[PDB]
Amino acid sequence: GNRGVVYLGPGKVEVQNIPYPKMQDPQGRQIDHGVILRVVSTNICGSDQHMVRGRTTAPEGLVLGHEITGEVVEIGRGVETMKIGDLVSVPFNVACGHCRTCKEQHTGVCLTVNPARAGGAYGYVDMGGWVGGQAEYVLVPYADFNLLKLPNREAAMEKIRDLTCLSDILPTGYHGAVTAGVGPGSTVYIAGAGPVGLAAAASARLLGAAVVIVGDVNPTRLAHAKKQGFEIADLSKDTPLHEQIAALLGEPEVDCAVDAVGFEARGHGHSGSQQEAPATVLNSLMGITRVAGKIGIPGLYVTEDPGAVDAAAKHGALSIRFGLGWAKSHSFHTGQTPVMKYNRQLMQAIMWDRIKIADIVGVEVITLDDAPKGYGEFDAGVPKKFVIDPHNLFR
Amino acid sequence: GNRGVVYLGPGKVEVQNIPYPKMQDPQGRQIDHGVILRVVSTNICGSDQHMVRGRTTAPEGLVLGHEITGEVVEIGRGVETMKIGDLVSVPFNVACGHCRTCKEQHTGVCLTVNPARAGGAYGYVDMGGWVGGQAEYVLVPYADFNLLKLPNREAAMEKIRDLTCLSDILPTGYHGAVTAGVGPGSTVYIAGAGPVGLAAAASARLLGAAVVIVGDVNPTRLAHAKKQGFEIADLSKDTPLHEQIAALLGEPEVDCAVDAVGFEARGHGHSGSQQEAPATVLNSLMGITRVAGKIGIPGLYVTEDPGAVDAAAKHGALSIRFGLGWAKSHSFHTGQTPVMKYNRQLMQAIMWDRIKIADIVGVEVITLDDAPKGYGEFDAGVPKKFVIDPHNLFR
Amino acid sequence: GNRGVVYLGPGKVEVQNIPYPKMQDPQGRQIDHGVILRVVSTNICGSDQHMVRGRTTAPEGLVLGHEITGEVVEIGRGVETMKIGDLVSVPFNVACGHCRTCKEQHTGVCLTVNPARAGGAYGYVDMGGWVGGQAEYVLVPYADFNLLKLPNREAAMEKIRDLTCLSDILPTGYHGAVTAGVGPGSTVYIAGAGPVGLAAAASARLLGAAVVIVGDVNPTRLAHAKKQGFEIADLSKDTPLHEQIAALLGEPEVDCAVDAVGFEARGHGHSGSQQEAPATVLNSLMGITRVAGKIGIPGLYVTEDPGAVDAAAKHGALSIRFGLGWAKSHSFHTGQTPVMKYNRQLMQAIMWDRIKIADIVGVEVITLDDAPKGYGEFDAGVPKKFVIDPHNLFR
Amino acid sequence: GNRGVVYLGPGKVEVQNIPYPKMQDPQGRQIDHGVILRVVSTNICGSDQHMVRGRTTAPEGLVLGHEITGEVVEIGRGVETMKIGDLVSVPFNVACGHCRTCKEQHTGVCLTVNPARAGGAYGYVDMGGWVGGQAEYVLVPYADFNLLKLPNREAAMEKIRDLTCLSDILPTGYHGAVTAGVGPGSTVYIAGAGPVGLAAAASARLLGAAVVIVGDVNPTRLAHAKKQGFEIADLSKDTPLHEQIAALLGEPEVDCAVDAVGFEARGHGHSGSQQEAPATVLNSLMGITRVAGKIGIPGLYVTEDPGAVDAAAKHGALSIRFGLGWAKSHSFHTGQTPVMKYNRQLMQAIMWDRIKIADIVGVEVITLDDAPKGYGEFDAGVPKKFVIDPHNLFR
Numbered sequence A, B, C, D: 001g002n003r004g005v006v007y008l009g010p011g012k013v014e015v016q017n018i019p020y021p022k023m024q025d026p027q028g029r030q031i032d033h034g035v036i037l038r039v040v041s042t043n044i045c046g047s048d049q050h051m052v053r054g055r056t057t058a059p060e061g062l063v064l065g066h067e068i069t070g071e072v073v074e075i076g077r078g079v080e081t082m083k084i085g086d087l088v089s090v091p092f093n094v095a096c097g098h099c100r101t102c103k104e105q106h107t108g109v110c111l112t113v114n115p116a117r118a119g120g121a122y123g124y125v126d127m128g129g130w131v132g133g134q135a136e137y138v139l140v141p142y143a144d145f146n147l148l149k150l151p152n153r154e155a156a157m158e159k160i161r162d163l164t165c166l167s168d169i170l171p172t173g174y175h176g177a178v179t180a181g182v183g184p185g186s187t188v189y190i191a192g193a194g195p196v197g198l199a200a201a202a203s204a205r206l207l208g209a210a211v212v213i214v215g216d217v218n219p220t221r222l223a224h225a226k227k228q229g230f231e232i233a234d235l236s237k238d239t240p241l242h243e244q245i246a247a248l249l250g251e252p253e254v255d256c257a258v259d260a261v262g263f264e265a266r267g268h269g270h271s272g273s274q275q276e277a278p279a280t281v282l283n284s285l286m287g288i289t290r291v292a293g294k295i296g297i298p299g300l301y302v303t304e305d306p307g308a309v310d311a312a313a314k315h316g317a318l319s320i321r322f323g324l325g326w327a328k329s330h331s332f333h334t335g336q337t338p339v340m341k342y343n344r345q346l347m348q349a350i351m352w353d354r355i356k357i358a359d360i361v362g363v364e365v366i367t368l369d370d371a372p373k374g375y376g377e378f379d380a381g382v383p384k385k386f387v388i389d390p391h392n393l394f395r
């Protein structure tokens, strides 16, 4: 008995029966280092949206989902730290724990788990074949390495809405803020008010930023951010970002900027916001970040976009105003979040009431049968982070 | 009075009589903090070549040169640590010493010395109208802050050909290597076998790199790099860069990469290399740097190139394969070198024979009258670094 | 007309007429780089107390005070950035701005301003003879480099009780926390609930620490810390520090520990707390900081203490259980805070209401005539930070 | 079929027959993650000497040796990257690869492999009861995480004298130098011309230091250091170290200082050097390191020393002149080397002839039966590093 969300072509996902998990890798070799989880909570990601919209090279039939929190039901013979019944947060990265990059804390780019390229992840295009976890049950390989044990079940269940964000979005937003150099007193600009943008804004606040400005083209997502105490920039109005920031800060620049949009970026302005223009965020962040600043880029950029705007963009080439960044001495930091690097201290923050992440990103808890509908609302721009409770454990 | 190298329009320089330096800034306000130097040695740079070629917005009449070594002949009334006769290395950055960026060692982007933008330099486009120093005498403002005191004059003069590199190219090459993450045992690729690239190679050697490979489309420069003990990759051949690297290393990746080419980049291959393609280096570096690696970009890129290949490149926009670097978790480091942050320890290294920079870059000493001829030769691609001795002090 | 707080021997200070400041250094040479301030607010520090208790080699007649906020009334001819009437925060460190340590942001240890050793500061033993500023007027040398310009007078004056802490204690407490490695999610122990200890605790809250525990032997300072939302360890109880921490956290250790006591440390327990044992804090921090942790030590330790417990301590030797910290792989960070490294970002934090520093440290505003009484109360251990308003400008 | 070096009480070691390795931990539990090695080379360490001299709480019967290079002859059933015949470097830390410290690269203080405290190592006091490897065969647990693969056996054995240093002393010396802040152009002082000190000196050279001065009380070691091209300081002479340094550099300070002596430190001077004084090195490093400088302390300090000079030292407590370090703003870095952090890039530098470590540390190859003789000669202070070749594979 297993089931989950399956990708079936542009705009299409459905809940299907799927195989119960097996203690083997995606090439069918047996493994001793894995566990099988009964899934407690499992979220929908903006990355999942890229795939569902037909924006990647994903195969039809892909089981989706890489934001898992779970409870051990089966343990492979080599696993030392796990017991049946243990609650765990699963980092979205599949990492081996023994290669050059895993050992150097670069668990987003594991050298062994994916025959095609460095880096692995559950239910995710080009990520080594590991089955996704928007499902009733899921296999986690290298369990001793990857898993974050949650505190006593009671206190954990009590904050599950928060803890479900440790799998992907909070550590990601956090990595965005830290690589952009955010610290106490920083002025911060955040591109994107989606779940990831909002997590970067929360992270920046937690890191002690003086002021945090969140930008989007979506007015409902900005209203959400504003109700959460952040400053906003509306990129659908005709007033340029520079001008919006200056009205707020008294200069047209920030200390730190985070790109939480990626390759489906829209342009700015009345008509610009209705046009896809994937270099937009990059170019505008070079424009607003002060000299010697750092740009953090958690937003996803791909080597291949079948639906992209032009030949160059189909192959991940953007028209980027690099001379500007260079003239401003900017440095840029990119790539999949190494979730494990931050997830334990972020847990401490949640448990100690330092960060109300669930309120901030607008967590909504849904049934597994509502998942397709959840994707639909998410696609239609709702200011929410959808959390699937597939066994009805806490809803 | 004084005389020096003057730019007269695309491809034209000549030595002219010019005013003796005055104790005032480019706005004509008196300064108490400056010194006037008799110029001992003064170098020709690839940056100078960009301007001479008419590839920047540099005006006719500009006095050239930002790589100065001198002797103090006059000091302003507020200068406390400099005395007459003192022999000094001058960082190419003009920096104030008291703004936010100068305090934080970002002295390539001083916020007060330039009304146009952050950052200053001598005889350099968009760099605040500080007068160039390919000349007999030159003004250095903020002398206590900027100047590097050279060792008792005998010892200094005997290593003049080396120390003349401290003003620009050695610290610049060094910046590129350290921001690319080079250290003991690193494998390193450097694009560009011009003097800056050779300084980057020298720096990586100093740092204890396991192996250093220098790439260029100009075979006579690669011959020179090879005779200095470096590995080479010839981009004018049709053999792809990753294949030349694998033949040297046994894998197609380096740990660290440095872009010492900048915006006049040629394409790769027999015919590709005969044509300008400004994004080529950046794209190639993402291709051969290993995941989670760092890319150092000392090479110059501009916000405006009058003679660029395309409308986009005229504005500093390049077709960059960003999605590739993003998928490899690359980080990118850019901009004008903070020369002061490294010049002291590099001088130490020079004085203790840990680095034979003059040999590595191919230093050649010339008379001031020979400057126009030297620019011609350098522009034609000879494997040399031209050092002007305007008062015939050591030649 | 000038007057200040003067040190007159163990336990003794009085307010005296003193010379109006002069544009010369402590050796009587004219300087062009200084300003004179009309003092707006000027604070009493724990460092001042060491000196008043006769615990240092401070000479009788020392004019005290290194915590200055002021209004420019005079300007030396070399000064570029200052105007009469400007409101400024004065970092307690006297720094030149052009030596090796000043350039690398080590402005607590300037090489040029003190003939006796590295590092200068106002009204401070062994700190170069710069006159103190617990006075109506004071000289600030190297004004362009050292001074922090405050916001429109009106907004600045309104937050004076907060901003006055930028001269010394907030940056210091901050340096304590950052060098101890504090970050989002940290568990933090801070030794000392004095104004500096409190600033460290505030800094740790601002840095996003999960839980902050402040320890002291003083019951009244702890009741004040507890009112400000911090956890407490009462070292006057017989319950050892381990046990109090473990009761609080469920393990007898913290990620990060800051020493905000210094060389007049008391031992632990009913009677231990009435004994001086200068090694106490260092040894107990090594006991409760987890493996590979960092210990930040802002608390002052001296080369000479005329009033110490024994021979060894009079020369700054302590019996330190180094083997313990070594076995735990601890790192240690020490010395005068480089205030300029942090003050600007801290000002932004204050102006944006991210840190209510005045309330936390218990700012109390007094007249210059009440200063001796202030010293008295401070010495008796009141949980307050004394701020003198010498011209009655805001009180 | 196995034997090795067994400790029998103060001053006494002998070769005995010992059990063949079993695939279990020191508690007798079965493990699937280990491999068994035929030992190729296995070294004698100063750490071993501490124990043999009776200066630790090490038990009679302890099998010695933590510096192993070997070939895999048997693999556990869960091992994924090791094959029989594989030739490997063993880091001396026993590390699990799944706990908090292991993941953060703090593999010197693993939290799971040792019931007594954090940190594990082979045949080493308080290090988890993992059996030592000056033996014919040895167990390495967590093989996929811990082992460093060496290349074609042929190229590897030709450099075996160098390669055998990667297990312990080269990465130790390297850790000491990097944490002392050593970089291109650094001036460095290293206390101790034992093998570890010599490896720090080699490291500092590799890292590009301007000048490296090694001190010792043992002149036969200093003769060796000088022959290896380093500067020396003789601490058995009455000339104070700061004067010896000034003679060499023209100032009495260094940029970086490394303590490669540890808890059996001798005093300085004709008579001082003849007596044990365990605070001596730490105290003199604070004396000669420049302000804001960093002190690396790879030398061992213990929480309990049975034969220490006084009551306090038996407990790991030293009379440290901390006031002086504090006034100079020193940082201090301590503890067991995380060998995995550095071993990969040091192997690269060895294979590409960037460091001739075996020559520098004075490697001498001996039989297993001659081990007691090696220990004796090493204790008499010869300038050599003993490498045991148990199966006569390359001697």
Ligand SMILES: NC(=O)c1ccc[n+]([C@@H]2O[C@H](COP(=O)([O-])OP(=O)(O)OC[C@H]3O[C@@H](n4cnc5c(N)ncnc54)[C@H](O)[C@@H]3O)[C@@H](O)[C@H]2O)c1
Binding pocket: A045, A046, A047, A049, A050, A168, A172, A191, A192, A193, A194, A195, A196, A197, A215, A216, A217, A218, A221, A235, A260, A261, A262, A263, A264, A265, A266, A267, A268, A280, A281, A297, A298, A299, A300, A335, A336, A337
């Ligand atoms: N590095 C990582 O680990 C990582 C992890 C998850 C997601 N991501 C990427 O981060 C992005 C965030 O996902 P999300 O969860 O935020 O999904 P999302 O797609 O809902 O959020 C993207 C937001 O960007 C907005 N936007 C579009 N153009 C914009 C512009 N010009 N300026 C500002 N905002 C603009 C969209 O309206 C949307 O609100 C996704 O692209 C995701 O792929 C990266």
Ligand SMILES: NC(=O)c1ccc[n+]([C@@H]2O[C@H](COP(=O)([O-])OP(=O)(O)OC[C@H]3O[C@@H](n4cnc5c(N)ncnc54)[C@H](O)[C@@H]3O)[C@@H](O)[C@H]2O)c1
Binding pocket: B045, B046, B047, B048, B049, B050, B168, B169, B172, B191, B192, B193, B194, B195, B196, B197, B215, B216, B217, B218, B221, B235, B260, B261, B262, B263, B264, B265, B266, B267, B268, B280, B281, B297, B298, B299, B300, B335, B336, B337
């Ligand atoms: N960051 C700084 O502060 C700083 C300082 C000085 C110079 N620079 C910049 O560094 C760059 C180099 O200066 P230089 O004196 O070394 O320049 P240079 O003009 O002598 O040489 C540049 C080299 O790049 C080579 N090249 C062109 N396309 C190439 C490709 N695709 N691959 C490999 N090589 C290619 C050319 O053959 C040439 O040999 C210049 O652009 C200069 O403006 C920056």
Ligand SMILES: NC(=O)c1ccc[n+]([C@@H]2O[C@H](COP(=O)([O-])OP(=O)(O)OC[C@H]3O[C@@H](n4cnc5c(N)ncnc54)[C@H](O)[C@@H]3O)[C@@H](O)[C@H]2O)c1
Binding pocket: C045, C046, C047, C049, C050, C168, C169, C172, C191, C192, C193, C194, C195, C196, C197, C215, C216, C217, C218, C221, C235, C260, C261, C262, C263, C264, C265, C266, C267, C268, C280, C281, C297, C298, C299, C300, C335, C336, C337
């Ligand atoms: N590094 C710097 O730049 C710098 C700057 C300012 C102050 N300091 C030093 O920091 C310390 C803090 O200064 P302050 O203004 O808070 O002075 P303070 O003397 O009021 O603070 C010291 C506090 O520590 C308490 N204490 C004594 N023994 C203790 C122990 N074992 N554990 C915990 N607490 C103990 C005392 O009760 C007192 O409350 C002083 O030493 C000051 O000199 C250093």
Ligand SMILES: NC(=O)c1ccc[n+]([C@@H]2O[C@H](COP(=O)([O-])OP(=O)(O)OC[C@H]3O[C@@H](n4cnc5c(N)ncnc54)[C@H](O)[C@@H]3O)[C@@H](O)[C@H]2O)c1
Binding pocket: D045, D046, D047, D048, D049, D050, D168, D169, D172, D191, D192, D193, D194, D195, D196, D197, D215, D216, D217, D218, D221, D235, D260, D261, D262, D263, D264, D265, D266, D267, D268, D280, D281, D297, D298, D299, D300, D335, D336, D337
């Ligand atoms: N950090 C680690 O993980 C690690 C690893 C290996 C060894 N160690 C420790 O490193 C130390 C040295 O390594 P080794 O094997 O070369 O040690 P060793 O004992 O062979 O040599 C120590 C040297 O220091 C000299 N010495 C003694 N007092 C001195 C003083 N006051 N000043 C200068 N030199 C003095 C001794 O004569 C001897 O030459 C030992 O303490 C060892 O326990 C630590």
Ligand SMILES: [Zn+2]
Binding pocket: A045, A046, A047, A048, A066, A092, A168
């Ligand atoms: Zn995701």
Ligand SMILES: [Zn+2]
Binding pocket: A095, A096, A097, A098, A099, A100, A101, A102, A109, A110, A111, A112, A113
């Ligand atoms: Zn891996």
Ligand SMILES: [Zn+2]
Binding pocket: B045, B046, B047, B048, B066, B067, B092, B168, B169
């Ligand atoms: Zn140049």
Ligand SMILES: [Zn+2]
Binding pocket: B095, B096, B097, B098, B099, B100, B101, B102, B109, B110, B111, B112, B113
């Ligand atoms: Zn400046």
Ligand SMILES: [Zn+2]
Binding pocket: C045, C046, C047, C048, C066, C092, C168, C169
């Ligand atoms: Zn103070």
Ligand SMILES: [Zn+2]
Binding pocket: C095, C096, C097, C098, C099, C100, C101, C102, C110, C111, C112, C113
């Ligand atoms: Zn200074």
Ligand SMILES: [Zn+2]
Binding pocket: D045, D046, D047, D048, D066, D067, D092, D168
């Ligand atoms: Zn050892």
Ligand SMILES: [Zn+2]
Binding pocket: D095, D096, D097, D098, D099, D100, D101, D102, D109, D110, D111, D112, D113
């Ligand atoms: Zn471990």
